[PDB]
């Protein structure tokens, strides 16, 4: 658990954005992206995932929040790893709360499997968070969530989900399927789905403008 890549608050952190990178990456690249759209009062924490064998690619080691066994909505999933990773994130959120940033001033999000982890954690934590930015991701362990509203703190959480229509790794179909299930677990009045023409398993600058909009609207300065 090395030091995350952090864009700190200029003065005192009154909100925080915890963002988790995709497969095989570190937090450094995304911290830079969030540095380019930061608000002075917001702390941007991009932790680094541990290197580990990934079943999908002949157990070649690379940074990974959990194991990837497949790429289909029907693929087998690493249930234990997903749940332990989620525990680690809630642990990381608890730390930021005991250090001065209330949970309802914290946004969780990520890219690909980082986003998937973001959705799973937000929807299973009794910690009330400010929102979720789920980029080019999916809902892990769909069939374990009941078919009604989740209840709990994040019944009414705001979710911004973004996907490219040319994504070869997480098909747009899989994101569309994820938002439909989302709209049955939380209040769909706060569920926004954003599609980006031509984007692949990537980000674009408009997607980052819409993420800034989302964060700035939900985490405004206290002063």
Host H or E run for residue 161: strand 159-164
Contact 106, 15 (CB under 8 A): yes
CA distances for 210 relative to 13, 115, 160, 223, angstroms: 22, 16, 9, 23
> Which technique?
X-ray
CA distances for 122 relative to 107, 108, 218, angstroms: 9, 7, 16
Sort residue 76 into left (φ over 0), alpha (ψ -120 to 50) or beta. beta
Contact 160, 214 (CB under 8 A): yes
Question: Among 98, 223, 118, which residue's Cα sits nearest to residue 161?
Answer: 118
> What string of DSSP letters covers 54-88?
EGGGTTEEEE-SS----SSTTS---HHHHHHHHHH
* Residue 52: CB atoms within 10 Å: 14
Host H or E run for residue 118: helix 113-122
What residue ranges define each of the domains in the chain, with the CATH number in brackets?
1-223 (3.40.50.1820)
Q: Is the dihedral of CA 81, 29, 38, 171 positive or negative?
A: negative
Contact 144, 216 (CB under 8 A): no
Q: 5-35 burial string, b = 16+ CB within 10 Å, else e? A: bebebeeebbbbbbbbbbbbbbbeebbebbe
Length of the chain: 223
Question: Among 159, 160, 161, 165, which residue's Cα sits nearest to residue 196?
Answer: 165
Residues labelled catalytic: 112, 167, 201
- Rounded to whole angstroms, the Cα distance separating 76 from 164 reads 24
Host H or E run for residue 182: helix 172-185
Contact 18, 107 (CB under 8 A): yes
3-state SS, residue 159 = strand
Contact 85, 117 (CB under 8 A): yes
CA atoms within 13 A on the CB side of 218: 26
Contact 191, 178 (CB under 8 A): no
> What string of DSSP letters covers 1-55?
-PPPEEE--SS--SEEEEEE--TT--SHHHHHHHHTT--TTEEEEE--PPEEEEG
- Rounded to whole angstroms, the Cα distance separating 46 from 28 reads 7
């Amino acid at each position: 658990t090395p030091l995350p890549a952090i864009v700190p608050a200029a003065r005192k952190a009154t909100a925080a954005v915890i963002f988790l990178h995709g497969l095989g990456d570190t937090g450094h690249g995304w911290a830079e992206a969030f540095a380019g759209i930061r608000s002075s009062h917001i702390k941007y924490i991009c932790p680094h995932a541990p290197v580990r064998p990934v079943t999908l690619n002949m157990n070649v080691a690379m940074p990974s929040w959990f194991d990837i066994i497949g790429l289909s909505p029907d693929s087998q999933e690493d249930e234990s790893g997903i749940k332990q990773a989620a525990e680690n994130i809630k642990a990381l959120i608890d730390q930021e709360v005991k250090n001065g940033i209330p949970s309802n001033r914290i946004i969780l999000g990520g890219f690909s499997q980082g986003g998937a982890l973001s959705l799973y954690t937000a929807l299973t934590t009794q910690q009330k968070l400010a929102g979720v930015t789920a980029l080019s991701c999916w809902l892990p362990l769909r069939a374990s969530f009941p078919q009604g509203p989740i209840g709990g703190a994040n019944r009414d959480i705001s979710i911004l989900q973004c996907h490219g229509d040319c994504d070869p790794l997480v098909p747009l179909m899989f994101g569309s399927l994820t938002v439909e299930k989302l709209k049955t677990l939380v209040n769909p009045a706060n569920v926004t789905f954003k599609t980006y023409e031509g984007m692949m398993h990537s980000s674009c600058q408009q997607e980052m403008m819409d993420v800034k909009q989302f964060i700035d609207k939900l985490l405004p300065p206290i002063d």
